[PDB]
C-alpha cells in the first residue's frame, strides 16, 4: 500500500524499491544506459540506490558517482548505499578489519564523489575480524561523517544479533538493516530468522535478487538468450545452474506461476517482485535492469502488491512447494 517505508526501526525513509548497480553499471550496460535508468528510477520516486566497492572493481561507483553529479540531484533526496569487503587483491584489502572498513569506505566515497554514503554495509561476515573491532569501525565511520547508518549483508541472525549486543556493550551504534537474498526460490532466511530480529532489535531487511538474477523472469525456459545475464563473461556459474536439471524444474513451476501473472493482469517479473514486498520485514527490494523496458516493467510491481491476497499467496506457496517450516 504505502510506497516509502522506514528501513527497519530507523528513521531513514527509503522507497519500497531501489536500483542496484551490480553487473550492469560500469560493466554489462553502457554508462549512457546507466544514466537513463537512474533518471527513470529517480523520476519515479525511487531514492534508494545501492552499490559496492567490488562491482566492476569500483567502476560501478564511478558511474553511479558521475550520474549523481551530472544530474545535480539534491544529496538530501538520495539514499546511497555501498558495501565494503573486497577492496583489493592485497591481504589487508579484504575483510572487516578496522583498517579496511575505513580505507575501503574512504575509497568508495572517493569514487562516488560523495562526502558520505547513507548506509555502509558489510558485504559478508568476516570470521577473521573480532565483532568488537568491526562494530567500533562501523561506529567510527559514522561519527566521522562518512556514513549515516551501517548494516550487514549475508550475515546470520546470530551474527547480526551479536553486532547489536556488542554495540550495546560498548555504547556503540548497532546495525539498522540486513541485506539478504529473497526471491521465489530463496525464502528461508527472510521469512524465518530475520522477522524475529525486526521485532526484537528492529533490524530491517533490504532483500536482493527478487528475480534470482533474471531466472524468475522466465526468459531461460528455451535456452540461454544472447545478451542475457547467463551469456555474459564470468557468469558461467549462472548458466550452469540454469541449464542444470534442478534449474529446469524451476522453469517448470514458472509456467504455473505465469498463469497467476496473466490472471492478475501483470507480468511474471512484476508478480515475483510484489511477492517479495508482501512481508513487513522487507523494507525494500533492490531491482536490477539492463534497459529501460525492464526497469519500467519492474516498477509496475507496486500495482501487483494489492492484488496479492492470501488466496494468491497460498496458491503460489503450493506451486513452489518450498514454504519454510517455522
Amino acid at each position: 500500500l504505502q510506497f516509502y517505508r522506514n528501513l527497519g526501526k530507523s528513521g531513514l525513509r527509503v522507497s519500497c524499491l531501489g536500483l542496484g548497480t551490480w553487473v550492469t553499471f560500469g560493466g554489462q550496460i553502457t554508462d549512457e544506459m546507466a544514466e537513463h535508468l537512474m533518471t527513470l528510477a529517480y523520476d519515479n520516486g525511487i531514492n534508494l540506490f545501492d552499490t559496492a566497492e567490488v562491482y566492476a572493481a569500483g567502476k560501478a561507483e564511478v558511474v553511479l558517482g558521475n550520474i549523481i553529479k551530472k544530474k545535480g540531484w539534491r544529496r538530501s533526496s538520495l539514499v546511497i548505499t555501498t558495501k565494503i569487503f573486497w577492496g583489493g587483491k592485497a591481504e589487508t584489502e579484504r575483510g572487516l578489519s578496522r583498517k579496511h572498513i575505513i580505507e575501503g569506505l574512504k575509497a568508495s566515497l572517493e569514487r562516488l564523489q560523495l562526502e558520505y554514503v547513507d548506509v555502509v554495509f558489510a558485504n559478508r561476515p568476516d570470521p577473521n575480524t573480532p565483532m568488537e573491532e568491526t562494530v567500533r569501525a562501523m561506529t567510527h565511520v559514522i561519527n566521522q561523517g562518512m556514513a549515516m547508518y551501517w548494516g550487514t549483508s549475508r550475515w546470520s541472525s546470530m551474527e547480526i544479533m551479536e553486532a547489536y549486543s556488542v554495540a550495546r556493550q560498548f555504547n556503540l551504534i548497532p546495525p539498522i538493516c540486513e541485506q539478504a537474498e529473497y526471491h521465489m526460490f530463496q525464502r528461508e532466511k527472510v521469512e524465518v530468522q530475520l522477522p524475529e530480529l525486526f521485532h526484537k532489535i528492529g533490524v530491517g531487511a533490504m532483500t536482493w535478487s527478487p528475480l534470482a538474477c533474471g531466472i524468475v523472469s522466465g526468459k531461460y525456459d528455451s535456452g540461454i538468450p544472447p545478451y542475457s545475464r547467463a551469456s555474459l563473461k564470468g557468469y558461467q556459474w549462472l548458466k550452469d545452474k540454469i541449464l542444470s536439471e534442478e534449474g529446469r524444474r524451476q522453469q517448470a513451476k514458472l509456467k504455473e506461476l505465469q498463469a497467476i501473472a496473466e490472471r492478475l493482469g501483470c507480468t511474471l517479473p512484476q508478480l515475483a517482485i510484489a511477492w517479495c514486498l508482501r512481508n513487513e520485514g522487507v523494507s525494500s527490494v533492490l531491482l536490477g535492469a539492463s534497459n529501460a523496458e525492464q526497469l519500467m516493467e519492474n516498477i509496475g510491481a507496486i500495482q501487483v502488491l494489492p492484488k496479492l491476497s492470501s488466496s494468491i499467496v497460498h496458491e503460489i506457496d503450493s506451486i513452489l512447494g518450498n514454504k519454510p517450516y517455522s
Binding site: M158, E162, S165, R168, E196, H199, K200, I201, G202
Partner: protein, 112 residues
C-alpha cells in the same frame, strides 16, 4: 551460548540462552513469549515483579528441574510467580509435593 540479561525490578540476572532453552515450554524458554518484555535499548528482559523469588526460578533452569522456595520468600508469593513464569504443571505439583501437600442416590449421599 548467547548471553541473556534479565532485569527483575532493578535486580540484574544473566545466563546463557541454552539454559533457558532447556525448557522450551516456559516463558523465558519460549522466544515468542518473552518477546513482549525485551528492552532493545539495554538488550535485556525487564520484569516489574518480585525480586527475592527469581533466585530459585533462574536456578530451576540451571539445575534443570529443582524448584526450591527461598526461606525468606512467602509460600503464596513464590507460588504465584511460578504461574507467571509458566514453569509447567509437572514442576508445580512437584513443588507442592516437596513443600508438603498431597441422582437417585446422589442426594441421600449428601446428608449422610
Amino acid at each position: 551460548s548467547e548471553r541473556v540479561v534479565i532485569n527483575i525490578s532493578g535486580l540484574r540476572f544473566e545466563t546463557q540462552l541454552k539454559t533457558l532453552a532447556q525448557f522450551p515450554e516456559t516463558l523465558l524458554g519460549d522466544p515468542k513469549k518473552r518477546m513482549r518484555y525485551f528492552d532493545p535499548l539495554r538488550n535485556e528482559y525487564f520484569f516489574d515483579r518480585n525480586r527475592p523469588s527469581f533466585d530459585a526460578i533462574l536456578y530451576y533452569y540451571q539445575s534443570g528441574g529443582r524448584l526450591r522456595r527461598p526461606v525468606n520468600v512467602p509460600l503464596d508469593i513464590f507460588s504465584e510467580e511460578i504461574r507467571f513464569y509458566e514453569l509447567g504443571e509437572e514442576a508445580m505439583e512437584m513443588f507442592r509435593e516437596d513443600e508438603g501437600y498431597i441422582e437417585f442416590q446422589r442426594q441421600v449421599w449428601l446428608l449422610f
